[PDB]
Amino acid sequence: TGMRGAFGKPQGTVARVHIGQVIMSIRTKLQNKEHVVEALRRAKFKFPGRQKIHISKKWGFTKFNADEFEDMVAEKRLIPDGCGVKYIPNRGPLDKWRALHS
Amino acid sequence: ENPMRELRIRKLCLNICVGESGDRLTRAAKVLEQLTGQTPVFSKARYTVRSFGIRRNEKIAVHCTVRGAKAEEILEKGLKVREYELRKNNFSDTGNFGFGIQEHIDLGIKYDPSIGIYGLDFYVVLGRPGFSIADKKRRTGCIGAKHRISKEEAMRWFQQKYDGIILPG
Amino acid sequence: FVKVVKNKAYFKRYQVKFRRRREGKTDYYARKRLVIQDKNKYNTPKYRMIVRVTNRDIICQIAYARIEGDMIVCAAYAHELPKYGVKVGLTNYAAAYCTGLLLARRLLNRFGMDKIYEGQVEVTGDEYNVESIDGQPGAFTCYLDAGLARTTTGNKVFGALKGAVDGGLSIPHSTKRFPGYDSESKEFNAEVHRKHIMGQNVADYMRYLMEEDEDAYKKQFSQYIKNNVTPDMMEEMYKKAHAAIRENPVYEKKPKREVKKKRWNRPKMSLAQKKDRVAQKKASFLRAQERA
Amino acid sequence: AKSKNHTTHNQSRKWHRNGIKKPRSQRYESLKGVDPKFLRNMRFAKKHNKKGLKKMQANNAKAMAARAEAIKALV
Amino acid sequence: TNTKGKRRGTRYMFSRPFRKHGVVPLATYMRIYKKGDIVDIKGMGTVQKGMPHKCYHGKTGRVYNVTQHAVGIVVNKQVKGKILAKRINVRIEHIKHSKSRDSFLKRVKENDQKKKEAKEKGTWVQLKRQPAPPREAHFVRTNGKEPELLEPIPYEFMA
Amino acid sequence: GRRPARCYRYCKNKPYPKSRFCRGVPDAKIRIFDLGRKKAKVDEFPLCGHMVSDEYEQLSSEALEAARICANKYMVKSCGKDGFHIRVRLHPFHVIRINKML
RNA sequence: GUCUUGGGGCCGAAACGAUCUCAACCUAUUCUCAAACUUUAAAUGGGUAAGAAGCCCGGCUCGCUGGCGUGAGCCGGGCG
RNA sequence: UAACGCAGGUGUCCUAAGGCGAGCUCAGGGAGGACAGAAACCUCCCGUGGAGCAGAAGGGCAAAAGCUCGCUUGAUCUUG
RNA sequence: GUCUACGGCCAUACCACCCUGAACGCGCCCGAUCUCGUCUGAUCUCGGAAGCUAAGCAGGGUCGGGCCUGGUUAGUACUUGGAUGGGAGACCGCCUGGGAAUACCGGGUGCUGUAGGCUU
Q1: SS3 readout for E37-50
Q2: Mutation target vs B (from C148, C152, C156; most B CBs, 10 A cutoff)
Q3: N or C terminus of chain F with fewer C-beta within 10 Å?
Q4: For residue E56, how many other CB atoms are within 10 A of its CB?
């Protein structure tokens, strides 16, 4: 058309990553450390550039972390709900939660 | 309860949705006129749905709002056609109850060969003294929380007053 | 069920009205126009006649607004009328006129223009004129300040107005709302008004109940008969009052009592009485749940 | 015919090569735009100090002498 | 790219900050303006009459014409080489008084007060605000304690 | 044609997401962002493996389809078919334009 | 978590009584975004003010402004 | 503050859709009522703009700038 | 201590609830001759004082939702100015200076002007 007016029309869809963004994430038993660490490098080959691989300190997909997590579940501040855990703070009317359940 | 809580009929509203304007409606206003003695008003259309026979601002229905002593006697005749019998789905969750009657003559109207075949709709608004404070203009407010009408609080007043009962449905 | 209207987000996105309109007492559309001065009249105050009716009292005030709060030049409550010679009926139309007559007289007696600007004693069909001398006594003015803007011929607030103008104030108005104004002929009458202004309709009302039924009469006016006031003296009592208001418009501001620091509901609960008590209150309600 | 469009980047040198950035703030700014009703009066107040000799400053003359006599006693 | 217009790009300029919609609070109106004092122009979107043009949203001047509902202003808006003094007319409920000059008329009073109070000390207390001096050497007490030994932390790669 | 991902690798345009002002965008070649045993409670898998980017770049949604399969295709052979849990923590939003100029 | 639901159905009232079972919903949670979305919100940046064009008193003038105030303007006097 | 950058609109429309004043409050949702049903009309409740204001989009607004009424033509003449 | 009328700031003033009331001070309220508007004296308007704090309103409470102000997040993000600094490049470290926001964790829940009452 001679570039007399060249605004592209869409095709495909892309996603951006910043330095430190987390592309892909896997959950597994603690005995499968090696199965995770190398399956990801198997995945690493289908991506431009280079990505570091390390095993997180965060229990599961939760916001909360390594082996202090089992205390709070026992301490009754978190409760397991499906793929995640609800934080039970104290600003909520816990005198109407403890009255409901200790 | 105490003297400041006695339940009363704030108002009672009657209407006929005749469906199409012209003559059948302007006959219908007579039926209400024969009943309560107050000049009724015609309610036009809010929307136009052609699967009824209605047009925008076509005069569809005539309604009325009786009040006070006049209301209570109209309810006495109105309830009698239903022989003081109702159901537990006739009492709204906001403390109102209603019903209908299939023919106008059953209240005390006199049939005439010029009169058509009309029914009409009943609906009773309970209330307690102080419920006008939600309408005042100079200074307004809410109605309350323990002074409102629950679902049950409507039924137990109705049952004792007009002797009737409610058949579960 | 369907989504609740009041979410945690709904409150975040809220916008309270101005407080006085939230309680419903002040109209902030009829204040922008009935209060604000123009900017080339820099500090010349603008006076309003705040006339309010309550279930058992009539309030009249004259005010001019400031950048912080209002300024009240004078006020004449209607429940001081037992002082002057009238006892029964303060929400009467005539009672309002007794208020509007006093408010002017007390205000004018403050400012030294009491001896002048008197107007008619009792007839209301005309405006009342002024004189202006620069930096010297003359030509008072104000504007009517109705509350929730209800204004239909015969309204009680227009009892004060005819009182104000006859009192000595000059209020721009029109005799289009004095009761007795025929709604469809648009004529000055001043006679039906003269009865309304003097309470002669109430005196007719009790003469109306006399013929028909005393039993209904007792239910209505049980405290007219207490400290007996019969219809035949009704206009006579008021004629004394309008005379009475003139000689003694001044106010003396009866003195107040001495406080023993009373409180009957509960103390004003501050941070500590909140912080420590409620930190207990949990530790108390906590104790019940571990004991059962 | 086909050609290049502009660019604007010496706008700041020419800008400040000369050029004083003040409007010459001045006493006695002209009365152009004032309210005519207001201005008519201030034209009258001037008019009745610029007219005559006996009415106005005969009051000014007396008051000044008191200003003359009062201040001197202090020295 | 876009084009000329009276209000172009004033989507946020006149946007009534986003927890305040409704009638302008009435302490805007009783504020009396007078010839020769300093105002700062600020656009408001509830008024729509006499709004200052977008170029004047922030420039300050002094009011020379006080009318019933509005106050003419002398403002400094610059075309390329010429910082003009342009007269505009705005409604009162846009602009507000400036606290800049009042921070000066506050110190004018005190400086003349101190000087007149010091006509009996015989010395001249010092003029305005020598700039911030150096920090005026002193001691530091540290007896009984010891400073902490700071050191860098090791590298921990988070997710 | 091919349009190799060398062209759209850097991040050199303002975000241009699928909205009312950009119509005709296709659907991304990735659609299933979670796979494995999804119902697993948080008690189950406490070893969360991550993959983290290191270049401020763009990843084509073509790749995320094949990276998800490639890492999934291994874990299935290693752990089982309900022994892990995979979540792609990246979504393709920023549509990218093309122009045919022949 | 239970209302219209289904799909598989059971009974033959009828099964969102119950119970399997998915589901549109609601409830709290969670993954990721926005140049033409935004509660918050910098760095850099834009006007002003930094005294005699002032500070302060006494008096006079008006066809505008009105409680008696006036706002504008004129004179005069001490401190730059 | 630019490009044959982007997503759009205009060459019109109004005796009211201008000017006042008054009285109301919208969108949406729930529960109840003869025919009446998801979808007419009647009542109550919740309802910070989620509606509407001619149209493009942005801004603005709830005892309005929205809706309905009653009167009118400030859509007039002349200076800057 | 508090209320009434008119307000300034316009949520620390809101919202959900629950508890108690400091002359009818505000209201609930009893009626429709007259003024006045309605289909309806429910609203609006007008005339009163037989009752009533139950409701409005005020005060308090909720390990409340909200709201204001703090704290950690963080000297992180971001950035004015410099380099013949690294890196093929994406970008990044440094010097000079300026410097935020959620999650999360605490504290607070009206101040007050003029005029007028009450000591219940």
Answers
A1: CEEECCCCCCCCCC
A2: C148
A3: C
A4: 22
